[model samples]
Target: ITENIETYVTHLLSDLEPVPSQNQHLAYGYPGERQVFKDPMLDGKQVVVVNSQYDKHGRPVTGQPDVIQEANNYIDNLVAAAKSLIDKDKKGEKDLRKNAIDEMAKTFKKSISETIPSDKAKADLFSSKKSSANKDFLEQLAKVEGSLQQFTQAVAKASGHKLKALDKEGHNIRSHNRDTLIHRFKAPNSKEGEEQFIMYIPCGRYTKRQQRLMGKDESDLVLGNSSMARMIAGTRHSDGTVTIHHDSFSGPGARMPYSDFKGADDYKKLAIKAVTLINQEEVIQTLAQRQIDRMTNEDLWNKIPEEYRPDELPPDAEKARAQLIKLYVEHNPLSVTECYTQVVTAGQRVAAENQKEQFEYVRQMMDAFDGSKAKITIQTGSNTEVETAVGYQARMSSWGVNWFRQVGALNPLSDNSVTKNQNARFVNQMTDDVIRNLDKVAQNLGDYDKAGALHTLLKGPDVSDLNQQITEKENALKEVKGAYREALFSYFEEYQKGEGKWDQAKLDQLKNQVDGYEKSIKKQESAIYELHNQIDALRKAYYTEHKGQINKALQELKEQISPVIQNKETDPETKSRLQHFYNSCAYLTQAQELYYENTWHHGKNNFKLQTLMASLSCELDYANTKGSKSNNDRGQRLAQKIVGNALWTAMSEDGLYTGEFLDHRRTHGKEVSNVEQLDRELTTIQALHHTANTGVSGGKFEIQDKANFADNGLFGKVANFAKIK
Candidate 1:
């Protein structure tokens, strides 16, 4: 086993190109998710009743104050929006598209009719679906579902999630947080609580295809690790303790057919069983490989049947023998660590930026962060000076949150593999071009003996000048590659570190830079691709445009120099000299064809590429908002206390809301020793029940002493208050 250990291990890990696990973003849901309404039951109560139902903005009572009129208005808005969606789908339909359009309309029409009404459906579905008689509660839940789904899908389309309903739309909100896994949330449950949770899915980061593949086997893994193996291993006990075990891998987990868990009990058992089987299969495969390696490494040829002695041994059989002997000898942990490090380092370097690196980095970070034990640290700076540290900690915390995105970029078998493959092709083409050029120099020497001599000399110091030139060219290539990667890394660092204003001007500048760089890179890539294609074209061009010319040139050289060389009795050296001319004719002809092929192909593609650029331009364009407004205006104008609270990072952890939360934190300082004390106050710190936009004129303000980074960073003190790592 020791002898074949490396080989057997290398083989085992050949398939280990970094399997993507859950990402931190999966915890957050998607960008622009409507699911923001999915808060727990209001005020620790099972329900939050309101006078009536309201619109997206949740204003003005529906029914109640004037019952009949409000209900009519509510139904009317519903019909109008539903019809607008239907009309939008139908107008441009044609042929099969027209039928598909109609089908979508039909499905949505049914859903809308049943889901929205004047209390009829709510009254009927209440018991089964957990509906309430209060239109306000029902509407809130529905809105919550819509928002949650929006956020979930955004995160899913980008990072992946368990529920399809949770991952609605291609949102990936995880991309927004610098830290995908760790986030400081003023714990929703307690007035004096603070905590960070494992958030996000990894594989779903870059593409929509990945989102479709995630299943319910990962549902409970919502926060930290969503992999079935990890989830089963860490299932919480009824007593609130944790236990760990290696899960079986015999049968892969499969999704149950229904949604909303109608038969949750039965489905859970089936899902667990499927995961166990899959895990067991993995264990068996592992054991089988070890057995094979033991036999191979021990050189136990005699153990095999005589007839099969010379036949190729079953895969790793020889190595299995060696493994048994090694295990019998002794075990060493250092060897294992060394082996793992080597294998991991050799895996493709997922780039932090650029097309090739973007997807790879995301993939790697996801796998690394998934099921990890790292603690998120908010800034430890003083409260007054905490702004900088708070921002710093937020950025640092973001490293975990968005780590999956960076790792996602690393998976070669995943969606972005094509880009990696293309880059490799680019590398190979350059290498091949250099080799081909060297062959031409040898061919030009003419006579067979001379050509052989030249080939031999090509490797000697006599040709050191050419060798030096090749080295210089290679160095240049390396320099360009480094510069490209660095630019990509810097760009992503900014992108991942959210917060602060991302003005339109900056975005435009970024767009222009990326556009220019992509063009240059693509041209270089395509040029290499074209260079390889031309090798074949050169053969064709030689036959059509130069083959005949070579024949005539060879004849002329022979006629003019043959007589002197034919004096074999006097000077055979003359013959060798004339033969050199003939070789030159042939070599020069081929060289011109090669040169023409490279140049013509380059120009042709360049012209054609202008068209390709239009398509690429669309792909290169990142539709992210380059600009943002004050979170305060959006939150406060909406008059949502939570929204208003969100505006403060001392309240929100984000900077824009920094001003208000800082103000509130300061006022409450003397009354509280730390953030948890402050946080407790914030939670119970109700907005004046009146719909006032500003000023403390009417409501009771539970005042406290003001504080800063000097006092203690908001998250840190509060986080410490809760004893969270």
Candidate 2:
């Protein structure tokens, strides 16, 4: 709006769409004023949406009337995404769809500074030619990029029914049917009973691949050999399922190698084999359930005050409603029956964000047929208790109970089974009924009501004071080292001029200086650590008040996560699984202190985070059991790799992905040679470079250290002192 009309015309013509393309990391804009995040800090990392935001009406906007109008066909996409993005935060119960454009702007604001063409061409955040600073810029860019991508994909997947990712290709944002990849499924680890949960399923056939070759068999087509270059060109599901392309490419890329019984049944057998082969790993069981832990819901019971949660059938709708009514009656001026009457009235008018949620909400409540499982309460009408697998045709509910007549009967389970509209209504009513009535619905056990009679401390405590201290000490520590090095440099130079001469006093002086500086660094690290813990303590204290308020029934949820180590389930489950395992082993290190600091913090929309979770989990699994005491330097090395020395240090935020590290540093801080630097710096594998299909049968073969090569992840930088030269 500030620019001239002519300039606006120029930008409109330049609106080639600064969106993700065939090359996900491509940056599209002029040097300093970039509209797209096209930085290639590490090979294979997706561009952040934008580090810093430019014209609201500038490039990279999906909100413009023209753009949105074009999305008419994708409203389901909008509804799905809006439903998924809906949730609570300190500011309020945030609807991600509502914050969709806002977060992009907020996310962009963080990538502030000069951009330059560096790191093999991509928008580098800092123009400084230094690799370390470049690393800093990229790492921040990577973190933001990852978070933004997660946000982006959730929008895409939630909105999957509509948009075609450019070049007609998109990241694995949606599944084979353009449905969200956050599938609810049963991970039958063995012949045993499997738990029902949600997980990120990135393994899907490309849309265009549908009619080519054997239609989806290309993903099943195994190329390369164990002794040579074996690869399963398919996406592996966390549940040990392998999804691949159609082998229709038998004429082209598949010409030389793939010539097996390539039939329609070929897919059937291959899928079975792939499933059987991967499940042989005992850890598949863990991966399946761990995937659950990685999912993103912040447990419903945790959202309300402790006194409100019921003790039985926690997920049951009736129990939840009964308790909520109890909570309102106890706190509000209204009576129990009246409260229920009013709340039920809210549901009739309170529609979900749109029909997508309405339909999905029904699916969440529907019985288990495509991984989604929930039995409808049946009335039977004296129809002799007959049963079936997943659905009922408008013939369900209890007999003579009049369950539908009650307020609570309208829904079931508060987890994913609950609708956004209902939750939104619940949230609004709580503010009307409870929160507005009491100052106590907010903050602390430190509810200081007496600074003076009317002067109650309404302000939430600020933790930035500690953050400021942490920054101060970090600088002081750097200053001490800088000064110490200079002193040593000057002394050494002076001594060299008198090269062969006896300089005992000066040597003693240097020793004293080095020791003092070393101590200072240690002290500085200790203070930073303590300062961090204090910040953690503050959050814990605030949340602890909430935690302590948790009811006996809800205590089970906390008990389930007691040791405070867990997954990337949805991604939180699987995502939480990897993060949990890492946190478990990582608790030994000081670096993961920050990892622990933002404990259970990142969102579910992050596919990269989920991808990284699986990698970390497997690496940890191998480093532990596949390890030994021999010159088992690898297990030890990778243990440190799993901890800090190589792996963990490379991943800054728990939210960062490892692919960037694999491509950049073999995926760690100390970038080693022989790393391809392109194509993820594909290092050599056993026989040659690594391949799938196993050197042995029942089979999956992997080379050494590749256990940590994470694919589809965001790269981040560590503190300069935290890295090796």
Candidate 3:
């Protein structure tokens, strides 16, 4: 069990979990470098455990043992340890916890004083200052000051858990409640159902107003009366009588809500609702279960909800999700199984409103459950009499004759009595299994298609050559434009004085010369466009073909899905329900196809465009025109943002958090804004400026010193670009 659990946890964490990006974007080093991730990104989401060993009444077990108090006491000690820094004696604080703080802070602070001085900053600053002595003195001082603040902030935030206040704190990485350690991480959307499988009674009391404000009342749902992890074992006949076998108790942890059971009498009531939503359009469902005509694999892949699509995630996170999916699909089966939340049907069928509501509420209850994942499975009677009794033992098998002891006391029809040999019963069971597996297959298919389509559009076959050709053409055109513009400038500079001293003949001659050059440049530009058109056509064709793959995979996936959708049945009734289940799975497969048709293609296009843009931006150098005053400020700002992203990527690869790495963009050409110049400029701005969120203490007024070359005169020139005399 331990091994399985660990394996499952590892796979799930690697694949499904969203790890927070270690590099802080805002660069707010909380006394030390603490990796902070905001939500919307993978980092803010989490999976956590909530202990439920105690009774719903909130009392400790009488004779078992006292665990909560013991755990709380340990936590109290840790808190005390944290508080010790305030003590006048402060000796043990530094000796005991300092190392942990320092280790964590290493990512945020300056490791060495020598790392900051860049060739560009040094060269530019010295020449611009026109004072070798002053430049030498200031450069050294700047380096030292930079190192001191880096170290200074690191030490302060280390001992104190208090992080420098940022815009907000996204998600909690560590949590505890007395006995258990709750480590939280992010996960894909599909896992939400599995993660919230364990139900527990709630002990937290709600205010009267809060209680009166909600839908279903939970006062009647008690721990002993209900099991949160309840599964409905049943067999239904084609004629409609269904026999339900209940195994309802699992100690304190099995109770509904883990805190309080607040809904319908039966626990399966919730499962039934979820089952209904499986066919509804209310929320995002797995693409395999969608009802859309996916023309290509890209089409199917695009249907995966953005949040669950792991491409935008960090490389580690994508790998983790993949691993978890592989493991989970193995035990759970490709087709839906009853014991797991498998697919059961196809078609755009809507669940009854009541069922939808119940599904929503019950799912929400799993948020704080004991962290047990849900499992789904299906059962089919053996093909023959003797095999039937042994293979699909009826509910009566709890006491039925053992196959080894009784050689021939078996009738296949009498096997699982709950299944009344009804055709509907057989179809239901079969369809359920098929649809579940089909859904699983569809997701894989969709992901594959998405990847293929993306590759074809961005990094696919024969793209490098095309890309190279296009790049060469673009470069040539740029050169032509530059040369022509220089010619025009030189001509004008010679022919026309600034005061309009006319030289009409010379200007006309120069203009004529530029006209010819312009014609050639235009022709080249047209050729480049034609080449781009070819690339665009290739992209379109790729998406189009990939769309077919999505459809083909989905269809094949559905074919595989048809056999597993079996309705639950005991005895001869299993035959009938199994038939119905098979149909249901078929219906679900169709429904999924429909869903994919509308949603998937759009997603593929978006991802393709996004990747293309990102790749293009990455290959360009936007800083060379740094001294041009009329150059787009927006473009510069965008470059700054790109620089931030590059810095993040660089920092992450080195396993350094943003806070720890003081110099992020020295390599990529980022300068920490000049603080003195900025301050001086800000000082000159009108007091009438009405923005409230702009003061020094408020992080509004900052020293504009470039982390790399603030002392360089390049910055001063740029600063004057915006100066008003």
Candidate 4:
């Protein structure tokens, strides 16, 4: 029964291989979400009802309110027309039936456009302008007239001689994914209020395919990656404030599956299971690793002790575990702090391992999405069929305009993960470009490898700040020289009053003092000259290397997705995701990026980058002016930057909204004090950085649907929505 402790633990954790246990449970729902409606109707309660419903967009009474009734009547005829087309499908008249469907749908569309011409047309120009590149759209629009076939005729299509409805025009809408999780507050819930609350960070959700593969039902399931594992825990501080710390990895793509609970029962079943499993898996991952770490540190194990370890449990494994624990206790004692650190490190490793798989999978899935062999679903009811990317892209060019026309980018609360990821991509690009610019700036000043030349050069004395320092010192020195000469003249006045008594020593002292002062000032001026050249070189290099690259990046990423929006080659799902994402950045009424766009379309390389600027700007205005306070409001903007960048910092202390990471050395801030009262309210501080474009924060704002993708049978397992109230 005295089996090795290593063997026992190896047996215990074997279930985690290939992935982790309840690995099925690793996918989580939306990082954060909320349903916000317009004012009055958007009040908390109404918003909740609206947010939860799939299509209840504060619609005016559909049957009442006479004007809206007319709208309903319009849809009634459209459905009737649609039903007629259903009969025509069996009538074996292909083009005739198809034109009827187009005419009806288009007529319905045109009525609204003409009725609310200003509003709808304004919205029309929103996305339809792309139609400018093609004329069939407007020409077809020049002639328009407008549903379901009358049930009588439609029923015959589904059946040869019986009352079956074969028309499946609704299939397109069925498989379409349109859910989005919107998060409104800083915290996960508002109950603890904003002051003391848990925060949400989006990681990912399981797709139907993912769930089925796990032997689970296809579902709107929630799961966890290490990111979730770390966010749920925390420490309360002495200052009555608290925060979480982490070792999780999330990247731009993590938000790809942004969603929330689909059913009350499902949420109850999967939510707890995933969270608890995440915690347990983390603990096991930690201890399993720690045992090895201990053995390694104490030099007690051979190169491959695990090779000798049998994972298959021996009879009476309990007894084996008992002995193993006995041995473990004596061989390695553990302090709580030590255990904590081990947990943190192990989590980080496991998180990286798991998320690496996710990223690779995403990349692979996307490959199929764009390939010609991919099956794309499109439906026209009776003749629904699969098309290639070209089919969907073509439809988009025409209806894509119609799509933009209808969507008009309404819903201030709309949010999407693709947009979040795109924004991050943009920010990261900007961040990287800034670094590249600095790299050149640093190298341009001198050799970076020759430590003294570059480091010392910047701090090595040809300082950017040599600006005022040199002048002030020279000014003070000149005043001092005058004072000394006047004093000396006073002392020597009596001796030289025509007495033929020349104080030769004193006269020499005066010349020598002035000479010394002059030499020092000249030397200082020479250093100042060098400093100017260095700064001049840095500024010029910045312009040459990376300036205006911000706008270039913004436009660059836009091109990657925008053309796809109009291309027939784009899979509808991918195409839809990109359009919503683009709309989030380009169309949101008051979105953060929109504000930046409005303020500076030319792009603000306006240079207070905190780039190499951090070094130069740190001291420039720092001594001259007080920095903005570091408290609530000040750091709140950092909070905005966090949200703007879709950062997971303050909430989970885990890495990010997407599954990627940055400067991940110590995600903990080690139970950051930044959120504490003293740092938040009790402190007043300043930013002392170079000025310009300070008012605008550059991160993008992403508010779209909770589930960024339209599950449209494409990835959907849940049969969501209602045909009637």
Candidate 5:
């Protein structure tokens, strides 16, 4: 029975397995789900103490008294040593209880205090010594050690707090709750059924003292104050809803109650109504989407209510409507109210710019005349002699044709030395013809002056005041609209309660007021456009009616005056007097001819002819005429104006004439002279201007008419005789 008992104890001891230590199961910093060990034994079973002498009452009445005694004694001593080790603050005494169990197991062969290390050594001890009592003691000892390990771990667990279990995928979830406004919710416009999170961090708020402590830059602080950072997850708009809002300034720039919301809701509602209302207009829709054509015109005219329609649409109504539509589209407004505002803005800007372009065009033409210069040496001695011969021939030729009818015979004055009576009659006849046309030319010049006066008036304070009124009206409308938008956003939820629910009575009143303002602006713009057209037409007509008369008069005046003025044999004072006559003729006659040339060629009023007249006067009056130092100063002043004019002209004519007229003045020692090659260069420029105007090509220019000769028929006859000589 003792050997059987010993064999059973030995088998039980061998069955005891190693208990997992702290390092094996509870590893430090290994972030994973921890296992919960409910049982202390290796199996799903508790450690059982077997007594060889006692019954099942757990009382010390074992028949194997020595083994039972050794087991109880080892258990009491093992537990006491563990308790002492746990209480001490020393580091090296941690394994003291475990060592005590092993030491007693070696000495008392029947003792049950077996450590995990001694459990393995029991096989060698049983094989060598073969002691039944030793096996019984070792078996009992394994049971006590297992129970002690379980108790220690339990006490530690109950006393200390445990960390939260990691998530299923083993990731930590973090949160930032301070200094931000966060929201996560379902969006109305989302097609994917997505979730969204929004954060409005109040980055702008900061204490001045805190900022100074941080030593931040002024611009950084300014940006921090002026702006906010937004963090968002998911699409901006997921549902059909949209948000447009602005800040409130109810009190002296501080947050208050709903009363302090600035009434922003009404403003948004108003803008929405206007946008939707204008879209309902079929004419506006057509203009917005389609190109203007005959179909577009009919559609527009038909869509307008009869009360609003013009009594009779003009022939160019389509063109005008098209231009207006272009302005609207180019403005590209965000809301319908803005569209109307932009319409008038575009009109005003275009009108001002076009007028400026016209004035600049005229200014350029005159400057070009000065820039395309050729220095002509006026050898008055020889030029006047030839001119006198030509003049006499002209008189003789006229008498030869007309006097034969008066006298019924050939007139001897045709071949005679210039006689006082004959020359006087011819001169008077030519003068009468020249002066008669000049009278008409002067009247045409007066009309041009009137055109200039109207232009000046159009660009003066009156127009400026009109523009100012338009600006004020626009600003007023924009401000009212802005205030209304503020009201809309302030009461956003209420205003968003659908259309027709806005404070209806006030809305209608403000709508009517805005519509009235729009109509008045339209009316004023229409009137201004009409006046511009009328002025332009009148100027065009005046130029057309007298262009030929002006041309003929200048041609004859040049013929008659060139002789007397070019006569060096004539006294200097007399020659100067002749020049005055020439200047007067050139102003009305020569200038008018060039005016027609440029206007007809350019297909508009370029103002070239008018500027040429201005430049000619400036040149002849200040620079060309002789005087003292004051004359030079006057020349410099006129030259300065001329150079400015020239630069402007060169820019307009595609750089056709570019030079420093002022430099020419300086280079010529502050004296202005006539270009000897003026006639030749002028002829070339005239041909180019003709080609540019007429769009003609392939010509080496020929003079086909007898009128082209200086003295008409006599000069032709004299030229033939000279060829014979």
Candidate 6:
């Protein structure tokens, strides 16, 4: 044991690594975090005090003495006491081991060096080695051990002052362990009461083991020191108030009265300002991530794209679509309006021309039939008078008029030139076209329904609440087990050590108690398991109900659109209008489906998109058909140009017209001239139509130059559009 003392002291010194540096590992969670101070320091250096009490903002209270200096003062007193004992020896003082005492002093000074690793002044002291003299080494070791214990008592006392300060500050530091404390305060005079700011003070006892892990020189301090490791502030408000409560758990305290801290409010403000200065992206992401856990199943399903079914269920796609649609409608009404009008313009141009040509062809056929005449010869005195007066005169008069009325054609006798037959034929053809294309239209609508149903049903509900309950129960059970084990083990050890030494009866009784405890725990576990199953069942049931409702709605939609589509009596324009409506519905649904499928991460269901599309399409069709004069003129011009070209080609191919052909040529010229006049009028109407057709394409719907996409991208733009004032 005597020989071991010198080696043991040497090994203790060797075990120490480098002293730990101030670390920023804790700062990772708060990427953009910065420290703010009442007195602006250019360097923004961190000032850490060990075992000191702080207020709500983690600022050190005033009136506390310098801890480092006080600790050093204790060291000075200890050194003086050891030195006095060494110096008091006479020439042959038997009480004093002079060489050993000197060596002890040297070792003590060297150990001090370990505490202040970065201090250049202490280099020589740390550099000193152990005394080579074997005779004096053991004696010095024993002296050093006694002094070390005294020094430890002093270090603990030094930490006590800071601990008291902490206590006064209302921070209840746990005994014998490092503590992570968080204090919260609401921003004064705010309607948002829940909005609060947080201060994080990470304090820990710098035990030898902890020091080793932290890469600090543990052997330097006789007793471990408890120090404030780091300070952090958190907030969500623009004024630097935190929107959510944060517990101190950032991988890393003393008594100080709460009221005693100087400039406590000021410190809190500084802390909040610091938190506010932090880059907001990380914190925002944290909030988003946490919201996932807080969201209801319906809410969660709304976050993800409707058509997209992730391997892991996501938030509701419908809500996201709603948000997007709001933006889209608010800002891009002009773009949407314009897109619709362009299509309508094209349709009107085509329909008007078809109607005019059909009308003209029917009129020309009526005229040709009406122009024909029949000749009759009367035989007056033809036979008898032919003998007697044949030489004199034989007279024949044509007086018969063959009157033929064309079925469904206009009566020539009436002033009304508009033919009923002509109008009926046009309506019949238009209706027939839509009736012929009904199947394709219905199939498209059906596709839309299918996609909508599949997308909506695929989404699952949020399980955040259930998960939280389980987490709470597990934590409670773990803590209970730990406490029970500690108590039981402690009791068993005491019993075995004292009266219950190796007795089988007592051992059996203890085992029975443990079994009883185990049974009770198992019973509670079973209860939790049953609760878990119930929640799962309820969640599944809710999902099914949601699915069924949507299915029914889609079925009703199919039923409603089918009959009208199949009816041939539906006019072409109406049929076409409905066809476009269903067409847009199909396209929007299919497009959204593809978007959700391909953009598995981002697509959301637009609840109002179909409505908006229908509205825009309806407005477009109205613009197309309401004013017919423009369309009629355009049709007439086109017909004239077509006929003129044909006549020119005929003239060019067959040369000059004569006899009956001359009459046809004159008629054709008249028709061409009429159509040209109509074409000129159509041009005028087209311009008027563009200027005043609908208010939807007016100033409000006009696109602003260089519009920006909002936070939600294109969807965000649409969402913002709806909200635009």
The clash count for each model shown is: 121, 65, 136, 60, 35, 51
Cα error of candidate 6 at position 150, Å: 11
Which candidate leads the pack in TM-score? 3
Worst 10 residues of 3 by lDDT: 388-397
- Model 6, backbone clash pairs (residues 3+ apart or across chains), number: 51
Please report how far candidate 5 places residue 87 from its true position, in Å. Answer: 84
Q: Residue-wise lDDT of candidate 4 within 231-257, one digit each (tens)? A: 111222333343322112111112112
Q: Give each model's whole-structure lDDT.
A: 0.26, 0.26, 0.27, 0.26, 0.27, 0.27
- As a whole number from 0 to 100, the lDDT of residue 293 in candidate 3 is 12
Give one digit per residue, the lDDT tens place, for model 5 in 510-610. 65565454455345434543443343344335647655654454455445545644565657565444434444444434334433243311312122232
Weakest lDDT window of 10 consecutive positions for candidate 1? 334-343
lDDT of 6 by residue, 1-725 (tens): 01111222222212222212233111101111121111111122222111223346432222112112222323343333333433443434423443444455455556644543322211010011232332232233334334445553443342332222322222111222222222233222223623222232322222222234334563111212222222222223443323221121111011111122234443232222122111111111222222222333444345446554345422544344333333322332110011100000111122232222222221221221111211111111112100010000000001100111111235433212233232222222222222334433444435445434433343334545765775576555554444434334433433323233456565456555645655665665556555556554554465446645544644454455446655767565554444354433332333233222322111122111222222222222211111112221222222222222222222221211111211121111212332222222111111111111110000111111111100001111111211111
The regions of model 2 sitting more than 4 angstroms off are 1-462, 488-502, 540-725
| Per-residue C-alpha lDDT of model 2 across residues 576-681, encoded as one tens digit per residue | 4433322322221211222224331122111122122223323222111111111011122222222221222222334322234332323322232222221121
**Model 2 TM-score?**
0.19
Model 5 weakest 10-residue run by lDDT: 337-346
What lDDT is obtained when candidate 2 is compared to the true structure? 0.26
Give the Å error, residue 549, model 6.
30
How do the predictions measure up, each by TM-score? 0.19, 0.19, 0.21, 0.18, 0.17, 0.18
Model 3 residue 279 distance off true place after TM-score fit, in angstroms:
63
| Per-residue lDDT of model 1, residues 224-255, tens digit only | 11111100111122333322111111101111
| Per-residue lDDT of candidate 3, residues 1-725 (tens digit) | 11122222233222233224333221211111112222222233322222212235322111111112111221222223333443334345555555654453343233332343332122222123445643653454345344434543444455554422110011011111101112121111212322111111111122222232233252322212110111111222233333321111111111122222235533234323222222111111111111111112243244455555445523553343333333333333221111111011111123222322322332222211111121221111111101010011000001111121112235432232221112122222222334344443333334234323322222222445655775676566555554554455445344324327656676567666666776786677457556655554554454455555544543443343323323233344433233232222223333223222322123112111111122121221100111001112211221222222223222222211122222322221222222221211111111101001110001111112333222232222222211211
Q: Model 3, residue 541: what's the lDDT?
A: 54
Model 1 regions lying over 4 Å from their true place: 1-163, 166-477, 497-510, 538-725
